[PDB]
Amino acid sequence: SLQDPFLNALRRERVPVSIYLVNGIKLQGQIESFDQFVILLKNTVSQMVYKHAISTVVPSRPV
Amino acid sequence: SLQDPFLNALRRERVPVSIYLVNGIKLQGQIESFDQFVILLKNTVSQMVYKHAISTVVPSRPV
Amino acid sequence: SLQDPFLNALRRERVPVSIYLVNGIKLQGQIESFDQFVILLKNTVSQMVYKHAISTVVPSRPV
Amino acid sequence: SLQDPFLNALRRERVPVSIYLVNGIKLQGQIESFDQFVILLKNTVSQMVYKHAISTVVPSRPV
Amino acid sequence: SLQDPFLNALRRERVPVSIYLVNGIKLQGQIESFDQFVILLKNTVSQMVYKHAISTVVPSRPV
Amino acid sequence: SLQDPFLNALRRERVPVSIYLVNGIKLQGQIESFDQFVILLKNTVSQMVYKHAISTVVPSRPV
């Protein structure tokens, strides 16, 4: 399983990520937390993103 | 695990939220209730939103 | 479970609803019936709507 | 399950239906066959439609 | 029960098909292979199409 | 199944692929890794792509 270690790295390293949604919208922030269905992306406020609506998670720099 | 405590906080605190749909539409209101598949968003009327159609849930202020 | 009591109320009360689809289209009618996957929306004819394509169900008045 | 008796009627009665897709596209023809995942819509040729891509099935007249 | 015989025919007969995606995009080629999640569509190269992203499979002539 | 051998080939051969997303976006890079839900596409950085958001995987040359 790749998803947990990948999201976990981005979390620990408080890396600025771009979460791209299935509709094309680009969300940005740091990954605050995550579970099986959602990812909490912190920014001005924490927003709960559903994984099912995420197409791709792009770190802003190598990890 | 994240989703339930997160939606639960927004509920108790009767916090104005913006639910963004996969189609880009922004719904607004307070979270009245929720289960495994839907979230009741109260406004002028209660509307049943399917989670599968939700991309992101954004509280209008920190919690 | 919120979905079943919610759709059930709209049914019994023969309330005019607007079913919004993931593509943005707004369907209208009364909820004739429903099961795990589809909702029968009566109008001129009964049309079978797949829940997976529904974003939000909006009653035309409080219930 | 409402889906099977509903599609079955449309089949037996060889009723002209409009299948609306999640992308907004309107397909037309008669329902030739169907199973748990797909519907064969006959027209000039039989096309296999995935139910997951169908938003709504609209008969061209009451049944 | 319909999907396998249908794709199997298109395969054996090496029939030019149009695979329409949920996003509207039209793919073309012959069905090289398929299992239960994805379809190999041969063209200039073989491309793996996810069935979940396919709305409709349209043969270019009757079968 | 064919997904695993197909992605595995593209991996071993470090073949430039185009992953097309359900939103129309074309991702490019080499397949670094993959599991049941996601594909790590290496580029400038590794990005985690959800398979559910992938429509088609197109190698840049035959394999």
Coordinates of C-alpha atoms in Angstrom, one line a residue:
Chain A
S1 CA 0.0 0.0 0.0
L2 CA 1.4 3.3 -1.2
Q3 CA -1.3 5.8 -0.3
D4 CA -0.7 5.9 3.5
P5 CA 3.1 6.2 3.5
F6 CA 2.8 8.8 0.7
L7 CA 0.2 11.0 2.5
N8 CA 2.1 10.4 5.8
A9 CA 5.3 11.8 4.3
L10 CA 3.6 14.8 3.0
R11 CA 2.1 15.3 6.5
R12 CA 5.2 14.9 8.6
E13 CA 7.2 17.1 6.2
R14 CA 4.3 19.7 6.3
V15 CA 4.8 19.9 2.5
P16 CA 2.6 22.3 0.5
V17 CA 0.5 20.0 -1.8
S18 CA -1.8 20.6 -4.7
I19 CA -4.8 18.3 -4.6
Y20 CA -6.4 18.1 -8.0
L21 CA -10.1 17.2 -8.1
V22 CA -12.0 15.1 -10.6
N23 CA -13.7 18.3 -11.9
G24 CA -10.3 19.9 -12.6
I25 CA -10.2 22.2 -9.6
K26 CA -6.9 22.7 -7.9
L27 CA -6.9 22.8 -4.1
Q28 CA -3.9 23.8 -2.1
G29 CA -2.6 23.5 1.4
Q30 CA -0.9 21.1 3.8
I31 CA -2.2 17.7 4.7
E32 CA -3.5 18.0 8.2
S33 CA -4.9 14.5 8.6
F34 CA -6.5 11.7 6.6
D35 CA -8.6 8.5 6.9
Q36 CA -10.1 5.9 4.6
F37 CA -12.4 8.3 2.7
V38 CA -11.2 11.9 3.4
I39 CA -8.2 14.1 3.6
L40 CA -8.1 17.2 5.8
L41 CA -6.3 19.9 3.9
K42 CA -5.3 22.8 6.1
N43 CA -5.2 26.3 4.6
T44 CA -7.1 29.4 5.9
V45 CA -9.4 26.8 7.4
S46 CA -9.4 23.0 7.4
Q47 CA -11.4 21.6 4.5
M48 CA -12.5 18.0 4.3
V49 CA -11.8 16.6 0.8
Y50 CA -13.4 13.3 -0.2
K51 CA -10.8 11.0 -1.8
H52 CA -13.4 9.8 -4.3
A53 CA -13.3 13.4 -5.7
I54 CA -9.5 13.6 -5.8
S55 CA -7.8 12.7 -9.1
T56 CA -4.2 13.5 -8.2
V57 CA -2.1 14.6 -5.2
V58 CA 1.0 16.6 -6.2
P59 CA 3.6 17.6 -3.7
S60 CA 5.2 21.1 -4.3
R61 CA 8.7 19.6 -4.0
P62 CA 10.4 16.1 -3.9
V63 CA 10.0 13.9 -0.8
Chain B
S1 CA -12.8 8.3 11.8
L2 CA -11.9 11.7 10.5
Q3 CA -15.1 12.3 8.6
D4 CA -17.5 11.6 11.5
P5 CA -15.8 13.8 14.2
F6 CA -15.3 16.5 11.5
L7 CA -19.0 16.6 10.4
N8 CA -20.0 16.2 14.0
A9 CA -18.2 19.3 15.1
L10 CA -19.7 21.3 12.3
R11 CA -23.1 20.0 13.4
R12 CA -22.8 20.7 17.2
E13 CA -21.3 24.1 16.6
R14 CA -24.0 24.9 14.0
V15 CA -21.3 26.3 11.8
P16 CA -22.1 27.7 8.4
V17 CA -20.4 25.4 5.8
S18 CA -19.8 25.5 2.1
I19 CA -20.3 22.0 0.5
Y20 CA -18.6 22.0 -2.9
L21 CA -20.1 19.5 -5.4
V22 CA -18.2 17.5 -8.0
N23 CA -19.8 19.7 -10.7
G24 CA -18.4 22.9 -9.1
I25 CA -21.6 24.1 -7.5
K26 CA -21.2 25.6 -4.0
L27 CA -24.0 24.6 -1.6
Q28 CA -24.4 26.5 1.7
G29 CA -26.1 26.0 5.1
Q30 CA -25.6 24.2 8.3
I31 CA -25.2 20.5 8.7
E32 CA -28.4 19.2 10.1
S33 CA -27.6 15.5 10.0
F34 CA -25.6 12.9 8.1
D35 CA -25.2 9.1 7.6
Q36 CA -22.9 6.9 5.5
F37 CA -24.1 8.2 2.1
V38 CA -25.8 11.6 2.6
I39 CA -25.6 14.8 4.5
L40 CA -28.7 16.9 5.3
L41 CA -27.8 20.5 4.7
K42 CA -30.3 22.9 6.3
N43 CA -31.0 26.2 4.6
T44 CA -34.4 27.5 3.5
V45 CA -35.2 23.8 3.4
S46 CA -33.3 20.7 4.3
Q47 CA -31.6 19.2 1.2
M48 CA -30.2 15.7 1.0
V49 CA -26.7 15.8 -0.5
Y50 CA -25.1 12.6 -1.6
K51 CA -21.5 12.4 -0.3
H52 CA -20.5 10.8 -3.6
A53 CA -21.3 14.1 -5.3
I54 CA -19.4 16.1 -2.7
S55 CA -15.8 17.1 -3.4
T56 CA -15.0 19.2 -0.4
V57 CA -16.6 20.5 2.9
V58 CA -15.4 23.9 4.0
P59 CA -16.3 25.4 7.3
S60 CA -16.9 29.2 7.2
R61 CA -14.6 29.6 10.3
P62 CA -12.1 27.5 12.3
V63 CA -13.3 24.6 14.6
Chain C
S1 CA -30.0 6.0 8.1
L2 CA -31.2 9.4 6.9
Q3 CA -31.8 8.7 3.3
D4 CA -34.8 6.3 3.7
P5 CA -36.8 8.4 6.2
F6 CA -36.0 11.5 4.1
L7 CA -37.1 10.0 0.7
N8 CA -40.0 8.3 2.5
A9 CA -41.4 11.6 3.8
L10 CA -41.2 13.2 0.4
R11 CA -43.0 10.2 -1.0
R12 CA -45.9 10.0 1.5
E13 CA -46.4 13.8 1.4
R14 CA -46.3 13.7 -2.4
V15 CA -44.0 16.7 -2.3
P16 CA -42.7 18.3 -5.5
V17 CA -39.0 17.8 -5.4
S18 CA -36.1 19.0 -7.5
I19 CA -33.4 16.3 -8.0
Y20 CA -30.1 17.8 -9.0
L21 CA -27.8 15.7 -11.2
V22 CA -24.0 15.6 -11.1
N23 CA -24.0 17.3 -14.5
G24 CA -26.0 20.2 -13.1
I25 CA -29.3 19.3 -14.7
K26 CA -32.4 19.9 -12.5
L27 CA -35.1 17.1 -12.6
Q28 CA -38.5 17.7 -11.2
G29 CA -41.5 15.7 -10.1
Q30 CA -42.7 13.7 -7.1
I31 CA -40.9 10.6 -5.7
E32 CA -42.9 7.6 -6.8
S33 CA -40.6 4.9 -5.4
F34 CA -37.0 4.2 -4.7
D35 CA -34.6 1.4 -3.8
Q36 CA -30.8 1.0 -3.2
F37 CA -29.7 2.4 -6.5
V38 CA -32.5 4.3 -8.2
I39 CA -35.3 6.7 -7.5
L40 CA -38.5 6.7 -9.6
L41 CA -39.4 10.3 -10.2
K42 CA -42.9 10.7 -11.6
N43 CA -43.8 13.5 -13.9
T44 CA -45.3 13.2 -17.4
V45 CA -43.8 9.7 -17.2
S46 CA -41.9 7.9 -14.5
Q47 CA -38.2 8.2 -15.0
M48 CA -35.6 6.0 -13.3
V49 CA -32.9 8.2 -11.8
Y50 CA -29.7 6.5 -10.6
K51 CA -28.7 7.8 -7.2
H52 CA -25.0 7.7 -8.2
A53 CA -25.9 10.5 -10.7
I54 CA -27.8 12.6 -8.1
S55 CA -25.9 15.3 -6.3
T56 CA -28.8 16.8 -4.2
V57 CA -32.5 16.2 -3.5
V58 CA -34.4 19.5 -2.7
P59 CA -38.0 19.4 -1.5
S60 CA -40.0 22.4 -2.8
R61 CA -41.3 23.1 0.7
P62 CA -40.4 22.1 4.4
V63 CA -41.2 18.6 5.7
Chain D
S1 CA -35.4 -3.7 -6.7
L2 CA -37.3 -1.3 -8.9
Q3 CA -34.7 -1.2 -11.6
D4 CA -35.4 -4.7 -13.0
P5 CA -39.2 -4.5 -13.3
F6 CA -38.8 -1.0 -14.8
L7 CA -36.2 -1.9 -17.5
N8 CA -38.1 -5.1 -18.1
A9 CA -41.3 -3.3 -18.9
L10 CA -39.5 -1.0 -21.3
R11 CA -38.0 -4.1 -22.9
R12 CA -41.2 -6.2 -23.3
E13 CA -43.1 -3.1 -24.6
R14 CA -40.3 -2.3 -27.0
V15 CA -40.7 1.3 -25.8
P16 CA -38.5 4.1 -27.3
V17 CA -36.4 5.3 -24.4
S18 CA -34.0 8.2 -23.9
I19 CA -31.0 7.2 -21.7
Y20 CA -29.4 10.3 -20.3
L21 CA -25.6 10.0 -19.5
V22 CA -23.8 11.6 -16.6
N23 CA -22.1 13.9 -19.1
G24 CA -25.4 15.2 -20.3
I25 CA -25.5 13.2 -23.6
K26 CA -28.9 11.8 -24.6
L27 CA -28.9 8.3 -26.1
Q28 CA -32.0 6.9 -27.8
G29 CA -33.3 3.5 -28.8
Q30 CA -35.1 0.5 -27.4
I31 CA -33.7 -1.6 -24.5
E32 CA -32.6 -4.8 -26.1
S33 CA -31.2 -6.4 -23.0
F34 CA -29.6 -5.6 -19.6
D35 CA -27.8 -7.1 -16.6
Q36 CA -26.4 -5.8 -13.3
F37 CA -23.9 -3.4 -14.9
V38 CA -24.9 -2.6 -18.5
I39 CA -27.8 -2.0 -20.7
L40 CA -27.9 -2.9 -24.4
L41 CA -29.6 -0.1 -26.3
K42 CA -30.6 -1.1 -29.8
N43 CA -30.6 1.5 -32.6
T44 CA -28.8 1.3 -35.8
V45 CA -26.5 -1.0 -33.9
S46 CA -26.6 -2.3 -30.4
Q47 CA -24.5 -0.2 -28.0
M48 CA -23.4 -1.3 -24.6
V49 CA -24.1 1.5 -22.1
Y50 CA -22.6 1.2 -18.6
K51 CA -25.2 1.9 -15.9
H52 CA -22.6 3.8 -13.9
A53 CA -22.5 6.4 -16.7
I54 CA -26.3 6.6 -16.9
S55 CA -28.0 9.4 -15.0
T56 CA -31.6 8.9 -16.0
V57 CA -33.8 6.5 -18.1
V58 CA -36.8 8.3 -19.6
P59 CA -39.5 6.3 -21.5
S60 CA -41.0 8.1 -24.5
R61 CA -44.5 7.4 -23.2
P62 CA -46.2 6.0 -20.1
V63 CA -45.9 2.4 -19.0
Chain E
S1 CA -23.7 -11.8 -18.2
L2 CA -24.1 -9.4 -21.3
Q3 CA -20.8 -7.6 -21.1
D4 CA -18.6 -10.6 -21.7
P5 CA -20.3 -12.0 -24.7
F6 CA -20.6 -8.5 -26.1
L7 CA -17.0 -7.5 -25.8
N8 CA -16.0 -11.1 -26.8
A9 CA -17.8 -10.7 -30.1
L10 CA -16.3 -7.4 -30.8
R11 CA -12.9 -9.0 -30.1
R12 CA -13.2 -12.1 -32.3
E13 CA -14.6 -10.2 -35.1
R14 CA -11.9 -7.6 -34.8
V15 CA -14.6 -4.9 -35.2
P16 CA -13.6 -1.2 -35.1
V17 CA -15.3 0.2 -32.0
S18 CA -15.9 3.6 -30.5
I19 CA -15.5 3.7 -26.7
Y20 CA -17.1 6.8 -25.3
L21 CA -15.7 8.0 -22.0
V22 CA -17.7 9.6 -19.1
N23 CA -16.0 12.9 -19.9
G24 CA -17.3 12.9 -23.5
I25 CA -14.0 11.8 -25.1
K26 CA -14.3 9.3 -28.0
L27 CA -11.7 6.5 -28.1
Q28 CA -11.3 4.3 -31.2
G29 CA -9.7 1.0 -32.1
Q30 CA -10.2 -2.7 -31.8
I31 CA -10.7 -4.5 -28.5
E32 CA -7.5 -6.4 -28.0
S33 CA -8.4 -7.8 -24.6
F34 CA -10.4 -7.1 -21.5
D35 CA -11.1 -8.4 -18.0
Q36 CA -13.7 -7.2 -15.6
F37 CA -12.2 -3.7 -14.8
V38 CA -10.4 -2.6 -17.9
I39 CA -10.3 -3.0 -21.7
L40 CA -7.2 -3.0 -23.9
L41 CA -8.0 -1.0 -27.0
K42 CA -5.5 -1.5 -29.7
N43 CA -4.7 1.4 -32.1
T44 CA -1.3 2.8 -32.8
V45 CA -0.5 1.5 -29.3
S46 CA -2.5 -0.6 -26.9
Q47 CA -4.2 1.7 -24.3
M48 CA -5.7 0.5 -21.1
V49 CA -9.1 1.9 -20.6
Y50 CA -10.8 1.7 -17.2
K51 CA -14.4 0.5 -17.5
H52 CA -15.4 2.8 -14.7
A53 CA -14.5 5.7 -17.1
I54 CA -16.4 4.2 -20.0
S55 CA -20.0 5.4 -20.6
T56 CA -20.8 3.5 -23.8
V57 CA -19.2 0.9 -26.3
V58 CA -20.4 1.4 -29.9
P59 CA -19.5 -1.1 -32.6
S60 CA -18.9 0.5 -36.0
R61 CA -21.2 -2.1 -37.6
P62 CA -23.7 -4.7 -36.5
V63 CA -22.6 -8.0 -34.8
Chain F
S1 CA -7.0 -9.5 -14.9
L2 CA -4.6 -7.5 -17.1
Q3 CA -4.1 -4.3 -15.2
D4 CA -1.1 -5.6 -13.2
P5 CA 0.9 -7.1 -16.0
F6 CA 0.2 -4.0 -18.1
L7 CA 1.3 -1.5 -15.5
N8 CA 4.2 -3.8 -14.5
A9 CA 5.5 -3.8 -18.1
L10 CA 5.3 0.0 -18.3
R11 CA 7.2 0.1 -15.0
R12 CA 10.0 -2.3 -15.8
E13 CA 10.6 -0.8 -19.2
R14 CA 10.5 2.7 -17.7
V15 CA 8.2 3.7 -20.5
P16 CA 7.0 7.3 -20.8
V17 CA 3.2 7.1 -20.4
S18 CA 0.3 9.4 -20.6
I19 CA -2.4 8.9 -17.9
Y20 CA -5.6 10.6 -18.9
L21 CA -7.8 11.7 -16.0
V22 CA -11.6 11.7 -15.9
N23 CA -11.5 15.5 -16.1
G24 CA -9.6 15.5 -19.4
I25 CA -6.2 16.4 -17.9
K26 CA -3.3 14.5 -19.4
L27 CA -0.6 13.5 -16.9
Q28 CA 2.8 12.4 -18.1
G29 CA 5.7 10.6 -16.6
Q30 CA 6.9 7.1 -15.8
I31 CA 5.1 4.7 -13.6
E32 CA 7.1 4.6 -10.4
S33 CA 4.8 2.3 -8.5
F34 CA 1.2 1.3 -8.0
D35 CA -1.2 -0.6 -5.7
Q36 CA -4.9 -1.4 -5.7
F37 CA -6.1 2.3 -5.6
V38 CA -3.3 4.6 -6.8
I39 CA -0.5 4.9 -9.3
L40 CA 2.7 6.8 -8.4
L41 CA 3.6 8.7 -11.6
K42 CA 7.2 10.1 -11.4
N43 CA 8.0 13.3 -13.1
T44 CA 9.6 16.4 -11.5
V45 CA 8.0 14.9 -8.4
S46 CA 6.1 11.7 -7.7
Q47 CA 2.4 12.4 -7.8
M48 CA -0.2 10.0 -6.4
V49 CA -2.9 9.4 -9.0
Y50 CA -6.2 7.7 -7.9
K51 CA -7.2 5.0 -10.4
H52 CA -10.8 6.0 -9.9
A53 CA -10.0 9.3 -11.6
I54 CA -8.0 7.7 -14.4
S55 CA -9.9 7.1 -17.7
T56 CA -7.0 5.7 -19.8
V57 CA -3.3 4.7 -19.6
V58 CA -1.5 5.2 -22.9
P59 CA 2.2 4.1 -23.3
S60 CA 4.2 6.4 -25.6
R61 CA 5.4 3.4 -27.6
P62 CA 4.6 -0.3 -28.0
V63 CA 5.4 -2.9 -25.3

